[PDB]
Symmetry: C4
């Protein structure tokens, strides 16, 4: 009945999460399609594309510069002469207007740019100048001190008949591609990278599942308004217990009111702004759905056969909260250590991110024999700190490895005192 | 005697499992031979075969297409002129008949195939047309829009004198090889892959171990009919305990009746359908054999010196079953999370398989510093979700790592209450 | 008040550690700049530079020698003709004087060097002779028995306008580079390596944050003199408790007097000797800062809500000290085993460092399936010791894996006896 | 005194183990020298040597054969013309006599060798014929069906002046090198491998540390005869306790009598048969030395401050022995499973070795996300067994991961019942 209304929320949450794991299957195949489109674009344009090579694509030489300039330039001339598909480079004037290239070959530079590195001085209007060449889809050179960056923006339509395999009509995706040499280091080494966007419009010559997603929205509303109303029972009850864990009899109701509302907001409203807001509101639903599993079990123990371990879940929070506080304080000072040493020879200690990632290496054994063995093997410097790397690392390995089991295990004996309470 | 009949089942199970680890040694060497034949075929035909390269073998260019067409075509002309062995390409007309090639060079295409990607439309009889060239073991071109796939089927016998090293006569293995270019993406990138089958017939010019396998079948029958009869004792006893763990005094008897029957069914009956049904019925025996080890120990404690830990095995099932239920519910919502985020930047969250594989990364430290460190390092997108990747990942690392020891360890204190029962 | 003076030490320690994580952010970006300068130098000079290749750069041939000699020699002639920046090779006479090269091409050799390896004898004045060629920034050959080593020292200024991106003036960094062929093995294989130093002087044409670092020094002094004085309270109290854990009420005061003094000594005094003494005194501060987190928590439990786990921290030291002693004794004999076997086929057992690194592999699962699986897979020798590698390794895996949990877990029951004391 | 005699054994064992870690340092540097000699030989002879490439060095073509034959043949002609050292190829007639080559170019073949693989038959005197060419250090072809194997044996002296860096005289090492093409597969793919031995004789023109090793032998004798005599005290005591743990008061005495005897037997007697018997008797000493650490601690607790955890070490053996028996029985049936499935798609399940190595993957997390994720990713076959690979693997991961902590942890509560005994 009314717990029937709740479990109908739960299994309907199971079913709509079927619908979401379904929709995410559908998008995951489509993102297979997007990612396939992406990898295909990278190799094809890749005059010189190598795997991992992307990690190092840079002209050491100016001839190493201008030739690839010629190379892509030949790409832009004779792409229709060459392509394994059909690509459609229409006017697409960018990125400043006036008028169209299609390949707009631009280049940023200093504006005032006196730089005597032999003199250690400059007179730089740190202003930059940028110049572009228009190359009608059917040669110049520049100062090696002079440039700031350089780019080749052009766009090429293509149409999606592989969706004919997906039983769908050929649609339109235009690839807008800027090719940037980036001279921002100015250090004689210059990476190129290539960017593109894809306009997914339909084909010019141009829903029982969509209705299913909508009806699932309706039942989860039947759920979430049960949640406002059982919370209304609960808030009249808040008014009454004031006037006179578990944790989620109201709280899951608002939070699954939240999960249902976030699925609704991804569907139509923010879904006219599809891509990312989809991803985030789905962020919200999955907490609805993880929540769906947990409270289904919470409705579903039958005491668990009698609530002893459910009693076990609570009281260690009162001490292990202070415990987690102290252990985090340790984690912070050690992250401070990781920030400190990590610069001198490290990638692992490399950011607040990297200090967090070594925290993966602390409790997880993936980081251990690699980091302390390799940093023991000393890329490093300064053999006192060759001593110091092992000393901090083996120092940092030992204490937390000795201690975390006692955090949980002083727990494991004291909820054995709460199981001294409970095991009877 | 009768427990002598049972332990004779056990050691005879040990001995026949010797015979199976033996037979699997024999097949494992033979599968070394099959796998060696496989690797040899791959390199040899591999006009362009590279290690891992298989991961990317694709013509970006149409000249990249037709040349390899020429390349393998030259393979098919002059393979006898070239081979490091002797290969035998006889008539072998395939894969449609009429008549023989041997290299049957086929190519699938659209049938109705109007496709204006510049127009975003098509008129496709989504029909495909396929054309083949017959090249007698002793040049054409096609529309780059037009093809659907392409293949080169031919077969080449060879004979097995390396079994002369195995003290066996030279037998016959014909390699039937289709070379497929697959244009199913139609995305200007086109992978080739090569397939072959091997007919293992005997050489034209052409068993104490086999009898040993049969006699082992007979003794395990002496076992399994003891199992029907001690289960007959047991089912008369089921009739009596109705009329008036351990777990396996009957149950292993049917299951080892099962293990023995599965070994028997792999031997002759399904073994005239050898390869896979072999693998599966051996699937069944190994549970017989793992079972053989366990119940040998179960017959073999002598109480263990007194059944205390055997008493320890049972009662946590009554609570840790509900516990495993809840912990699995957590695993499912987190797998839901893994399905959700895993698409945006991931290989690890990549299927229900991939969500299962990250479940290896959860409890096993192989997945941790790699996944959360690398996804922290953000292939990714959208630095809010650059935040979100660490937040979900470090969120997902923390709780289960804190908690699973308490599942087993609330166990470790409550069968310390069942050892409060038992440790006296 | 006075505990206000202490917590002001703590949060001011938090804030100055903000200032240090800040300053280390600043240096970490600058060391990004140094490391970027380093990687750029390596590739650019790298006539033949490959990734990892550095692991094997060696002329097998004498032509493999002298050509690269020509190659770098061409580098030294026409570097201004070639460079992607502007590099400044001024007089820079080195490394012996008289006068300048800039590329000083030197070569060490034996002095008395009779060596009949066909005779197994020598007449070596083990004296070495070294000869150098002066190549004005705008060919000879030597005995392959004869050389000891060879080098090409020259220096090239450059100026730092990328700091213009850091909003800083172009400064001066001179790269002094010796190119050494090292013939010390004399074994027909000869590695080259290239070294450089960088003089960071300012540009010729040429501080609210620095004042902030100084004022932080002042407040931490207000802290550390509170530490001398509360230790003065404490040492008058030492005089009184003599006359009549916690651990750090005095001890952190001297040690954070230490942390504050080490930050001060890195700032100005040893900071006129900047680089390394910076790194080490920062070594000292981070213990101040890890200490800052811990004693903030120690001041911050409010009993923790009542000091039970704080009581839990102590008494196991009285037994687990002897326990850690014994377990270390095990670790030493096994490290002795690692020293013993590790030579015959190993990199992992490779030093006292390498024996320590396998100690990472012992408790951490990063080293296990790799080492015992690969050394099981037997690079190795001598299949008795093919037996022995698995036998020692699987022997060495088993005992400590069985035992360390009982060290902590005989702990986990005996501070369950100290929690037999405490859990009431 | 007499425990002084024992601790003098212990610290003298510490000191001689210093002497052994020393001697193993000396041999480890020398094995650095041997391994350096090895790597140098591999690259230098390596007409085509690549890293890892060794994993695949094989002629697919017969021209791929005979050319490398020419290549090494040119090696043998003009090695003195080419070498980065001086190499000494003297008469060295091998490997059959009569007389000398130096490069003895041999080739094994079938003797009777009729093989119609087109006929699936043969007439093989499985006899092999071998033919050799003598190439005086200053062209033929053979049947591609015909060969069995082929080899190029020659030897080249060289002399060790790098020991001049070790302050030692140039000695003599002759490298005897057979180059074998091995046609044993006969499968059209043919690997070459090259072997060499090195004769370490002294240079023709041609010990306080050795005396230190001898005197250490003498003191450990003073120890081991104390061991025979305190065991004589102990065996008179065996006679008395018959007439009327700890574990090692006698037992370490014989075993360290063993460790001392094994060091002695490696020194002189078997040490005139140096290399391997050195390695094995050192195998024996390290157990002496691990033993030296343990019994030093056993002599060294001072009760440990009171023998409670020493009491903790014993009684779980009485149950956990039966426990380890059962858990090993599980390990065997699962190793049986690993033998069973491991063939169909596996390297990890690859031998009894490989089944043991997956046992590293079971308890160690190095094997988990790789094996079950990659075998989940299905090299594999037969998607039922695509199901089966995850099912066995995730099946095999779960139980032992759930259970081993309870083995040690039913231990951790029952020596909490033995600490129910002991924690008072």
């Amino acid at each position: 009945r009314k717990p029937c209304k709740l479990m109908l929320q739960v299994v309907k949450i199971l079913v709509v999460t079927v619908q979401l794991i379904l929709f995410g299957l559908s998008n995951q195949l489509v993102v297979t399609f997007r990612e396939e489109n992406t990898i295909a674009f990278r190799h094809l344009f890749l005059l010189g594309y190598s795997d991992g090579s992307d990690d190092t694509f840079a002209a050491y030489t100016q001839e190493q510069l201008y030739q690839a300039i010629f190379y892509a330039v030949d790409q832009y001339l004779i792409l229709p002469e060459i392509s394994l598909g059909r690509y459609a480079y229409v006017r697409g004037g960018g990125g400043p207007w006036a008028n169209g290239s299609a390949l707009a070959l631009c280049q940023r530079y200093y504006h005032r740019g006196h730089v005597d590195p032999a003199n250690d001085t400059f007179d730089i209007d740190p202003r930059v100048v940028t110049d572009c060449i228009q190359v009608d889809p059917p040669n110049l050179t520049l100062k090696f001190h002079k440039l700031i960056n350089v780019t080749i923006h052009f766009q090429l339509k293509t149409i999606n008949l592989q969706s004919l395999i997906n039983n769908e009509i050929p649609d339109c995706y235009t690839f807008s591609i800027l090719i940037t040499f980036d001279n921002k280091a100015h250090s004689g080494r210059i990476p190129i990278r290539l960017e593109t966007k894809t306009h997914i419009q339909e084909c010019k010559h141009p829903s029982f599942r969509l209705l299913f997603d909508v009806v699932v929205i309706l039942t989860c509303s039947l759920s979430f308004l049960l949640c406002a109303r059982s919370l209304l029972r609960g808030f009249l009850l808040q008014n009454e217990f004031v006037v006179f864990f578990v944790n989620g009899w109201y709280i899951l109701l608002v939070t699954s009111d939240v999960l249902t509302i976030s699925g609704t907001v991804m569907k139509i409203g923010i879904e006219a702004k599809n891509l990312a807001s989809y991803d985030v509101c789905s962020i919200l639903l999955g907490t609805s759905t993880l929540l769906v599993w947990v409270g289904v079990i919470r409705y579903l123990t039958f005491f668990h056969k009698y609530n002893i371990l459910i009693a076990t879940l609570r009281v260690a929070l009162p001490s292990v909260m202070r415990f987690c506080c102290c252990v985090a304080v340790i984690y912070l000072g050690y992250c401070f250590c990781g920030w400190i040493v990590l610069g001198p020879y490290h990638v692992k200690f490399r950011s607040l991110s990297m200090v967090s990632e070594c925290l993966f290496s602390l409790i997880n054994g993936d980081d251990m024999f690699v980091t302390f063995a390799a940093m023991q093997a000393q890329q490093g410097h300064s053999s006192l700190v060759w001593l110091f790397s092992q000393l901090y690392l083996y120092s940092f390995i030992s204490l937390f490895i000795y201690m975390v089991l006692s955090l949980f295990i002083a727990l494991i004996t004291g909820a054995y005192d709460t199981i001294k309470h409970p095991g009877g």
